[PDB]
Amino acid sequence: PQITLWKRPLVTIRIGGQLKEALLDTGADDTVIEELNLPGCWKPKLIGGIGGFIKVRQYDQIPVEIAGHKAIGTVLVGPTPVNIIGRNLLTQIGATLNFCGGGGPQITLWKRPLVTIRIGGQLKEALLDTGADDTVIEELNLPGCWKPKLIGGXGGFIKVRQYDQIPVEIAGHKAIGTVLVGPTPVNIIGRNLLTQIGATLNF
Ligand SMILES: CCCC[C@H](CC(O)(O)[C@H](CCCC)NC(=O)[C@@H](NC(=O)[C@@H](NC(C)=O)[C@@H](C)O)[C@@H](C)CC)C(=O)N[C@@H](CCC(N)=O)C(=O)N[C@@H](CCCNC(=N)N)C(N)=O
Numbered sequence: 001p002q003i004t005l006w007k008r009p010l011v012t013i014r015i016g017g018q019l020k021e022a023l024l025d026t027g028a029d030d031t032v033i034e035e036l037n038l039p040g041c042w043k044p045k046l047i048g049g050i051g052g053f054i055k056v057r058q059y060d061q062i063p064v065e066i067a068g069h070k071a072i073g074t075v076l077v078g079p080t081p082v083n084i085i086g087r088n089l090l091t092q093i094g095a096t097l098n099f100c101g102g103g104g105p106q107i108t109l110w111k112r113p114l115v116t117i118r119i120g121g122q123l124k125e126a127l128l129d130t131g132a133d134d135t136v137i138e139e140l141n142l143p144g145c146w147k148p149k150l151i152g153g154x155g156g157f158i159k160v161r162q163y164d165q166i167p168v169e170i171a172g173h174k175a176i177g178t179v180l181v182g183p184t185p186v187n188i189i190g191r192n193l194l195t196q197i198g199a200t201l202n203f
Contacts, residue, residue, distance in 0.1 A: 001067060003201040005191040009130055013085065014065040015075070020083050022066070024201055025131030026097060026113050027188055028086030031064065032076045038062055045076060050136070050153025050184055054078050069093040069203065080154060084131060087112070093203055097128055099173060100198040117189065118169040119179065124187055126170070130201060132190030135168070136180045142166055151180060158182055173197035 003009050009024040016038055030047060042057040056078030063072045066085055071092040087109040097107040107113050113128040120142050134151060146161035160182030168175045170189055175196040 001203055005130060005194045005199060005201070008133070008191075009201060011067045011085075013067075013083070015062065022083035022085045023131055024066075024090065024095065025084045025086055025129070026090065026095075026109060026201075027127050027129030027131045027186075028084050029088065029112070030074065030076050031086045031089050032056065032078065032080045032084045034077075034080055034083055036077055038075065038077060042077075047076060047078075048185060049155055050151065051156025051158055053155050054080070064089055066093055067203070081152075096202050097130075098200050098202050099171075100200070104173075104198060105171065106202075115171045115189070117171075117187075119166065126187035126189050128170075128194065128199065129188040129190055130194065132188045133192065134178065134180050135188060135190045135193050136160065136182065136184040137187045138181070138184060140181060142179065142181065146181070149180065151182075158184070160184075168193060170197055 010021050013020050013022045038059045040059045042059050045056050045058045046053040056076040058076055060074050062075040071089040073088050090109045114125050117124050117126045142163045144163050146163050149160050149162045150157045151160055160180040163179050166179045175193040177193050
């Protein structure tokens, strides 16, 4: 399957005998599933993102079938709003990011998909994040009257400033669109600009 990023990349998974919906998230190191039973030895972990940290239970060697592809690995169980399939299991299903092109790279997920971007004249590092609706960057100055917004992740909500029609180059591909500026843990390129540079998920 090639999955476009016009909407959230939600797929059916099978885990612990149960069928669930989960978001394919290149911006997640780990896989985080809603409160559920996994008999097995577990250990406590805290994981973080936008809004802060949540406490989860770490189970290992849990089989997870993702759109009919078998994977097995570590699953973190806790109060997430959205079941998230992260890179630990995406790699096992041979998921890549691809920008269409006689060019456009193919990016595997064994390491975080970090890229250089140019925004406001400034080179920054940012994570290609299919789990993010929007693009969120650390405090910087951009032009415009910005609308304050709140966005959430996972650990809660944060306040951001919204800037619209901002040029952004992402590994050399041109985008112009909405950028949210605020206290994000990591600079993230979300689906609003991934779609502009032709990015798809591919198994
Ligand atoms: C639980 C909500 C969906 C999860 C994604 C996660 C993520 O954007 O991929 C981020 C990106 C990096 C940190 C910012 N990844 C993470 O948050 C993950 N963190 C990590 O992988 C690492 N943590 C750190 C600190 O980097 C690791 C060391 O623990 C965790 C899931 C834990 C594995 C997320 O936070 N998406 C937001 C991004 C902000 C945005 N505005 O786009 C989003 O789409 N939010 C929307 C909708 C939220 C979901 N809505 C829904 N109906 N399900 C919003 N408007 O509030």
